[PDB]
């Protein structure tokens, strides 16, 4: 109605990787002008599963920012393209931010969606305030057992031919092949019937995804290439204590390797205290995991997101002076000294708040 | 078309009004490179990506243009020397903070002090013997 | 020979820092006790130490913040870093 607004479109198969438009759900915040957050769900996962998380009055996330539950290419409602390059998918978000008139946004992700969110900060750091990654890390996960199961489920899902198979044939095939209960439920909800009861099909492009996973090479979604580079902004990582995707022993090192400003464990990298359970990857289903993720997310958005690198928190905005490098300013008659870095309005490009406040400033003087 | 639509749009690619006054990093990062870090190759990608944005990925403009050093690092060795003279213990404290987070045992710390002061004591006895040879 | 893969949980240097420090200083003392004219070697090394460092300072370090950058060696790193990526994506490009 008002808070939940998902723009309706039809996926278009595109030959050019630049003519790709992303669709998703928009969640309006409680207050008038708030920065926006763009969040990516796990690969082949519904955006609607995160709606109760982002609209929970106890967590009160919308009090901080507007949330875009956006689908990547070949997923859900967005356009389809055979390439899964993280740079090409990152440029999709920039065209989405432009068409939606968003100057800069916070990026979030779950699982593989965490890699996608962090990749956008790697390729467009000036348009991204921060990255909040849930149960993911910028590392090659092609050989993790959790990814192999997901890779195996997508491969088995290519066997089903929707024209010949009946509905009862599909239900039996999924229960027997997909043993994970959550992956089974997610894949069933991705099945949808086209207009005029033409046939059934998965919402995500099963052909393009299977070739990406089955090939198991550098462009796979499980892999993180060196080509992606380094993210220079604020990054926060949260994952379960016993997670099949992020192992606390060594899978934290990629975060320091890719993110330049990560301080370490206990500051930007936390683990949710929990038991061994293969379903603990889906933090929004369990209140214990969801409460900790939401509190850490509120702390990131409130005090650490979109703050200059050399400032500690948002509390230092306007009272902490950063040293300046010599011969860095165009003015020749400039006395070099410490300064407080400029923080800009979240959508200053598409509004005239700086022009309006200039005129109000002249009325004072 | 939408891709070229936003590349031409002035609102999308436009410096802020105060951008001229701000401190500007006048290097792409090729002047001082991190050689032994595990993310060394990822650093080079960002340098290459920064050089490409400056020339719209027409690197012939960079080849013909002027190349400049990192002028922000000028006289940096002098400035650290004067800060050490100003407050030597405060300079040494913060420059060694992260290293001192791992503290060795009392034995190792005692051996450091014991062998250091012992070497200084023998140095003083060698100086006093040189005055004996001069006499 | 083959790559000397260590099967251990920690590297050899960090596990034997105290021991390697002993043998490190043993050979320093060994050379120090053996070299009775060590002061003659220190003085004989002063002139070349000053000369070669002042002569090659700009070409090694001074160029990074003074007159010319001399980015020839960086261009060789940047090209090789791009080839490293092309080889990593060989299967994709050929497919």
């Amino acid at each position: 109605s008002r808070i939940i607004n998902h723009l309706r479109g039809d996926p278009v198969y595109q030959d050019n990787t630049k003519d790709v438009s992303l669709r998703g759900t928009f969640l309006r915040g409680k207050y008038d002008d708030l920065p926006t957050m763009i969040f990516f769900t796990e690969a082949c996962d519904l955006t609607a599963n995160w709606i109760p998380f982002f609209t929970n009055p106890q967590y009160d996330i919308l009090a901080h920012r507007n949330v875009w539950l956006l689908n990547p290419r070949n997923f859900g409602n967005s356009d389809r393209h055979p390439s899964f390059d993280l740079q090409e998918m990152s440029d999709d978000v920039m065209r989405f931010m432009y068409s939606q008139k968003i100057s800069m946004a916070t990026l979030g992700g779950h699982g593989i969606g965490g890699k996608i969110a962090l990749a956008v900060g790697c390729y467009h750091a000036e348009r991204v305030t921060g990255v909040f990654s849930i149960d993911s890390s910028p590392m090659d996960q092609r050989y993790h057992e959790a990814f192999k199961e997901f890779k195996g489920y997508v491969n088995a899902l290519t066997e089903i031919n929707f024209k010949t198979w009946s509905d009862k044939d599909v239900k039996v095939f999924l229960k027997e092949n997909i043993k994970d209960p959550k992956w089974r439920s997610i894949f069933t909800n991705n099945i949808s019937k086209n207009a005029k009861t033409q046939s059934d099909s998965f919402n995500f492009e099963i052909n393009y995804l299977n070739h990406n996973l089955n090939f198991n090479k550098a462009d796979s979604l499980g892999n993180w290439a060196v080509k992606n580079g380094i993210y220079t902004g604020r990054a926060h990582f949260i994952f379960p204590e016993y997670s099949r995707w992020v192992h606390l022993a060594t899978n934290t090192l990629p975060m320091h390797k890719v993110c330049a400003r990560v301080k370490g464990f206990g500051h930007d990298i936390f683990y949710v205290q929990g038991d061994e359970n293969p379903l603990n990857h889906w933090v929004y289903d369990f209140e214990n995991y969801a409460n900790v993720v939401a509190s850490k997310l509120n702390k990131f958005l409130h005090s650490y997101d979109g703050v200059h690198a050399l400032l500690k928190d948002r509390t230092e905005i306007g009272n902490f002076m950063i040293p300046d490098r010599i011969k860095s300013r165009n003015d020749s008659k400039h006395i070099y000294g410490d300064y407080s870095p400029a923080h800009l309005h979240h959508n200053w490009r598409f509004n005239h708040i700086y022009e309006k406040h200039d005129e109000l400033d002249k009325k004072l003087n | 078309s939408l891709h070229e639509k936003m590349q031409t749009d002035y609102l999308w690619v436009k410096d802020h009004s105060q951008a001229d006054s701000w401190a500007k990093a006048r290097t792409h990062g090729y002047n001082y490179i991190a050689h032994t870090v595990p993310n060394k190759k990822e650093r080079y990608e960002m340098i290459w990506r920064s050089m490409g944005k400056s020339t719209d990925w027409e690197l012939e403009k960079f080849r013909l243009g002027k190349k400049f050093p990192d002028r922000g690092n000028k006289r940096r060795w002098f400035k650290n020397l004067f800060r050490l003279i100003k407050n030597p213990m405060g300079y040494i404290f913060w420059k060694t903070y992260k290293a001192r987070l791992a503290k060795p045992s009392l034995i190792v710390t005692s051996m450091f002090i014991g062998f250091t002061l012992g070497f200084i004591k023998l140095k003083a006895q060698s100086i006093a013997y040189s005055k004996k040879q001069y006499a | 020979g083959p790559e000397q893969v260590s099967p251990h949980y920690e590297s050899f240097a960090m596990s034997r820092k105290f021991l390697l420090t002993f043998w490190g200083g043993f050979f320093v003392l060994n050379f120090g006790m053996a070299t009775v004219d060590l002061n003659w070697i220190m003085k004989s090394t002063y002139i070349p130490w000053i000369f070669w460092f002042q002569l090659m300072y700009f070409y090694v370090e001074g160029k990074n913040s003074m007159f010319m950058p001399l980015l020839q060696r960086f261009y060789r790193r940047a090209a090789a870093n791009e080839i490293f990526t092309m080889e990593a994506f060989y299967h994709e490009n050929i497919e």
Binding site: - | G52, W57, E58, L59 | -
Partner: peptide, 17 residues
């Protein structure tokens, strides 16, 4: 996959390629 991003990759002083 990966493509050369430098548009002047095949430029020489005598012409293209």
């Amino acid at each position: 996959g990966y493509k050369i991003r430098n548009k002047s990759i095949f430029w020489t002083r005598a012409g293209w390629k």
